[PDB]
Amino acid sequence: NVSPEARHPLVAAYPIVHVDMENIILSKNEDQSTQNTDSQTRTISKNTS
Amino acid sequence: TSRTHTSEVHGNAEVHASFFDIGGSVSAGFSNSNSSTVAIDHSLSLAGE
């Protein structure tokens, strides 16, 4: 894999690696919660006066 | 427990007529009052839910 130009004793053979970013994905950490409830009651007031 | 007081002032008038008797009367007076009441309760209320 050493490229042909660098098969000469006076040309150096070395890699030039470089990282590039193609996309950035941020994900907002947040918890959310819903709640449904329903209730019935019955009072029987017996009263004297 | 409660107790009330009432003041009152009035004047009424009635006029009489007949075949030959005609008269018209008036009046005047005032009335006061003094109450005294008490009330005792007893209640119950059972409520489920």
Side-chain angles (χ1 to χ4, degrees):
Chain A
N1 296 112
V2 182
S3 74
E5 274 90 19
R7 306 282 184 109
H8 205 285
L10 307 178
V11 184
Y14 69 107
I16 311 175
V17 192
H18 163 61
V19 190
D20 59 270
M21 194 190 195
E22 295 197 352
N23 217 12
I24 169 69
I25 306 156
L26 55 87
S27 45
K28 178 166 185 211
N29 167 53
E30 154 172 13
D31 45 355
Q32 47 207 20
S33 154
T34 67
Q35 165 145 29
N36 285 91
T37 175
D38 58 87
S39 88
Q40 299 133 12
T41 179
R42 281 192 166 97
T43 176
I44 317 174
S45 160
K46 170 192 300 290
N47 179 29
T48 318
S49 298
Chain B
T1 83
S2 166
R3 51 184 216 203
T4 81
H5 162 256
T6 314
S7 315
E8 190 262 1
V9 47
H10 87 100
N12 307 347
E14 290 85 355
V15 180
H16 158 264
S18 277
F19 190 54
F20 60 97
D21 290 14
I22 292 95
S25 284
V26 283
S27 168
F30 48 90
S31 198
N32 313 75
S33 174
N34 168 66
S35 298
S36 283
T37 186
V38 292
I40 294 195
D41 202 301
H42 267 72
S43 298
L44 188 45
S45 194
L46 275 55
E49 205 152 345

